[PDB]
Amino acid sequence: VSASSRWLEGIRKWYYNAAGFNKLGLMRDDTIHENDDVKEAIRRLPENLYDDRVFRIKRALDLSMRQQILPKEQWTKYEEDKSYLEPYLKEVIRERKEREEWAKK
Amino acid sequence: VAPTLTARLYSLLFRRTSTFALTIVVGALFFERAFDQGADAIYEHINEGKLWKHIKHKYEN
Amino acid sequence: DEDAVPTLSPCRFTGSQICHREDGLPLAHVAIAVEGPGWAHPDNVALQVANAIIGHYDCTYGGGAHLSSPLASIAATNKLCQSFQTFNICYADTGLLGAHFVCDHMSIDDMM
Amino acid sequence: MLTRFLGPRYRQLARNWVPTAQLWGAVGAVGLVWATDWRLILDWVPYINGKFK
Amino acid sequence: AEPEHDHRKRMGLKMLLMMGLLLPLVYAMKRHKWSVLKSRKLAYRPPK
C-alpha cells in the first residue's frame, strides 16, 4: 500500500515514460509481439477496439516513418493506458493450456 | 526569362520521353568534355609537378 | 444593383488524393480526373469525342467482348469492374475531366 | 498471312509513331557515338574537339 | 611502390566533384517521390 508500493509504481511509471510508445500515441497492448495466441486475441476483439487499434498502429507507423513524435499532451498517459488485449489474450492462453493438458494423457 | 525558362525546357524537351532522352544524351556528351577539362585544370593548378617539365628534355628529338 | 455585386474568382485545381478506406463496404469506388477547361472553351468538343471513344460500361450491357471501346471490352471479358463512366464536368474556367469506376477489391489496380 | 496488319488504321498507326521512332533512333545514334567516342562521326561537332587534329 | 598514385588522385578529385553534384540530386529525387508520404494527413472517423 504505502511508500514501497508507490516507489515500485513510480519505477514502473518511469520505465513506461522511458519506453516511449506513449510518444507515438500507442498503448502498451499495441506494442505486443504477434504470436499465435496474440493473433487470435486480436481476432477476438470487438469491432470498436479493433478499429481503434488499427488507427493507433497507423498513427505510430506514420510518425515512426518521418521520425517525428506526438505533442506532449497527446502522449498516452500511464495508467489511463487501457490494457484492452489482456483479458482476450489470457483466455486464449487458458484455452491453449487446456488443449495441452489433454494432449498429455 | 525565369518562370517561362524551366517552362520552355519542359514544353520543348521534357514532355516527350523522346526528347527527354535525346537531351540527356546530347547533354551527357558536352558535359563530359566540360567536366573533364574543367576538373583536369583544377588538378593541374593545385600541382605543376608533372609534364610542365616536358618543355625541357623533349624538343631535342 | 449598384454596389455589392461581385464576380467569381478562379478556383485553383490542385491534384492530389483522398482515400477513405472502409473494408466494410463490398465494392470500391474510385474517381480520377485532370483539370479540364471551363464551359466557354472550344475544346470541350474534342474532349467529349475522346471520352465517347472510351465510353461507359455496366454489368447489364449486352455485348461484352465485342464492345468497340477497348476499356469496356477488356473490363467485360476479364470482369474488371461492375461499372465505369467517363466524364467531363464543366465550371466557370475550370473542370474535372476523367473517369469513375466501381469494382471488387482485387481489381482496382488492373482497372486503373 | 501478315495481311492482317494492312489497312488505313495501321497506316495511321505507323505515322503517329514515326516522329517517336525517328527520335528514338537519334537517341540510339548519339548514344552509340558518345559511348565509343566515334572518331569519324564526332570530329564534325563544333565543340568536343578533344582530339585536336 | 605506387605508380598509379597521381592518376588515382585525379580520379579521386573527380569522384568527389561528381559525388558532390550527384549526392544532393539523387537525394532531391528521392525526397520528391517520398513527398506524397511525408505530408500525408490521416483522419479517423468511426461510426457514432
Curated annotation (Swiss-Prot), chain A:
Annotated InterPro entries: QCR7 (IPR003197), QCR7_sf (IPR036544)
A single GO BP: mitochondrial electron transport, ubiquinol to cytochrome c
A UniProt-annotated Pfam family: UCR_14kD
Modified residue annotations for N6-succinyllysine: K72, K82
Residues recorded as bearing N6-acetyllysine in the entry: K13, K72, K77, K82, K90
Topology versus the membrane: Peripheral membrane protein
Record's GO cellular component terms: mitochondrial inner membrane; respiratory chain complex III
Keywords for this protein: Acetylation, Electron transport, Membrane, Mitochondrion, Mitochondrion inner membrane, Respiratory chain, Transport
Taxonomic superkingdom: Eukaryota
Location of the protein in the cell: Mitochondrion inner membrane
Function: Component of the ubiquinol-cytochrome c oxidoreductase, a multisubunit transmembrane complex that is part of the mitochondrial electron transport chain which drives oxidative phosphorylation.
Subunit structure: Component of the ubiquinol-cytochrome c oxidoreductase (cytochrome b-c1 complex, complex III, CIII), a multisubunit enzyme composed of 11 subunits. The complex is composed of 3 respiratory subunits cytochrome b, cytochrome c1 and Rieske protein UQCRFS1, 2 core protein subunits UQCRC1/QCR1 and UQCRC2/QCR2, and 6 low-molecular weight protein subunits UQCRH/QCR6, UQCRB/QCR7, UQCRQ/QCR8, UQCR10/QCR9, UQCR11/QCR10 and subunit 9, the cleavage product of Rieske protein UQCRFS1.
Similarity remark: Belongs to the UQCRB/QCR7 family.
Protein name: Cytochrome b-c1 complex subunit 7
The species this protein was found in: Bos taurus (Bovine)
From Swiss-Prot, chain B:
GO cellular component, one term: respiratory chain complex III
One BP term from GO: mitochondrial electron transport, ubiquinol to cytochrome c
Keyword check for Transferase: no
InterPro entries xref list: QCR9, QCR9_sf
Segments traversing the membrane: 21-46
Keyword annotations from UniProtKB, A to Z: Electron transport, Membrane, Mitochondrion, Mitochondrion inner membrane, Respiratory chain, Transmembrane, Transmembrane helix, Transport
Membrane topology: Single-pass membrane protein
Pfam families xref list: UCR_UQCRX_QCR9 (PF05365)
Predominant localisation class: mitochondrion
Subcellular location: Mitochondrion inner membrane
Keyword presence, Mitochondrion: yes
Mitochondrial intermembrane side: 47-61
Mitochondrial matrix compartment segments: 1-20
Highest taxon listed in the record's lineage: Eukaryota
PANTHER family given in the database record: CYTOCHROME B-C1 COMPLEX SUBUNIT 9 (PTHR12980:SF0), UBIQUINOL-CYTOCHROME C REDUCTASE COMPLEX, SUBUNIT X (PTHR12980)
Assembly behavior: Component of the ubiquinol-cytochrome c oxidoreductase (cytochrome b-c1 complex, complex III, CIII), a multisubunit enzyme composed of 11 subunits. The complex is composed of 3 respiratory subunits cytochrome b, cytochrome c1 and Rieske protein UQCRFS1, 2 core protein subunits UQCRC1/QCR1 and UQCRC2/QCR2, and 6 low-molecular weight protein subunits UQCRH/QCR6, UQCRB/QCR7, UQCRQ/QCR8, UQCR10/QCR9, UQCR11/QCR10 and subunit 9, the cleavage product of Rieske protein UQCRFS1.
Stated family: Belongs to the UQCR10/QCR9 family.
Function field: Component of the ubiquinol-cytochrome c oxidoreductase, a multisubunit transmembrane complex that is part of the mitochondrial electron transport chain which drives oxidative phosphorylation.
Protein known as: Cytochrome b-c1 complex subunit 9
Swiss-Prot record, chain C:
Subcellular localization, as worded in the UniProt entry: Mitochondrion inner membrane
Top-rank taxon, per record: Eukaryota
Subunit structure comment from the entry: Component of the ubiquinol-cytochrome c oxidoreductase (cytochrome b-c1 complex, complex III, CIII), a multisubunit enzyme composed of 11 subunits. The complex is composed of 3 respiratory subunits cytochrome b, cytochrome c1 and Rieske protein UQCRFS1, 2 core protein subunits UQCRC1/QCR1 and UQCRC2/QCR2, and 6 low-molecular weight protein subunits UQCRH/QCR6, UQCRB/QCR7, UQCRQ/QCR8, UQCR10/QCR9, UQCR11/QCR10 and subunit 9, the cleavage product of Rieske protein UQCRFS1.
Function: Component of the ubiquinol-cytochrome c oxidoreductase, a multisubunit transmembrane complex that is part of the mitochondrial electron transport chain which drives oxidative phosphorylation.
Family of this protein: Belongs to the peptidase M16 family. UQCRC1/QCR1 subfamily.
Protein name stated in the entry: Cytochrome b-c1 complex subunit 1, mitochondrial
Organism name: Bos taurus (Bovine)
Taxonomic placement: Eukaryota, Metazoa, Chordata, Craniata, Vertebrata
Gene coding for it: UQCRC1
Full-protein interval shown: 258 to 369 of 480
Swiss-Prot record, chain D:
Protein name: Cytochrome b-c1 complex subunit 10
Functional summary from the UniProt entry: Component of the ubiquinol-cytochrome c oxidoreductase, a multisubunit transmembrane complex that is part of the mitochondrial electron transport chain which drives oxidative phosphorylation.
Species per Swiss-Prot/TrEMBL record: Bos taurus
Keywords: Electron transport, Membrane, Mitochondrion, Mitochondrion inner membrane, Respiratory chain, Transmembrane, Transmembrane helix, Transport
Transmembrane segments: 13-35
Oligomeric and partner information: Component of the ubiquinol-cytochrome c oxidoreductase (cytochrome b-c1 complex, complex III, CIII), a multisubunit enzyme composed of 11 subunits. The complex is composed of 3 respiratory subunits cytochrome b, cytochrome c1 and Rieske protein UQCRFS1, 2 core protein subunits UQCRC1/QCR1 and UQCRC2/QCR2, and 6 low-molecular weight protein subunits UQCRH/QCR6, UQCRB/QCR7, UQCRQ/QCR8, UQCR10/QCR9, UQCR11/QCR10 and subunit 9, the cleavage product of Rieske protein UQCRFS1.
Similarity comment: family membership: Belongs to the UQCR11/QCR10 family.
GO biological process: mitochondrial electron transport, ubiquinol to cytochrome c
Subcellular location: Mitochondrion inner membrane
Ranges of the Mitochondrial intermembrane topological domain: 36-53
InterPro entries, sorted: Single_a-helix_sf, UQCR
A family per Pfam: UCR_6-4kD
Domain of life: Eukaryota
CC terms in the record's Gene Ontology section: mitochondrial inner membrane; respiratory chain complex III
Record's bilayer topology term: Single-pass membrane protein
Mitochondrial matrix side: 1-12
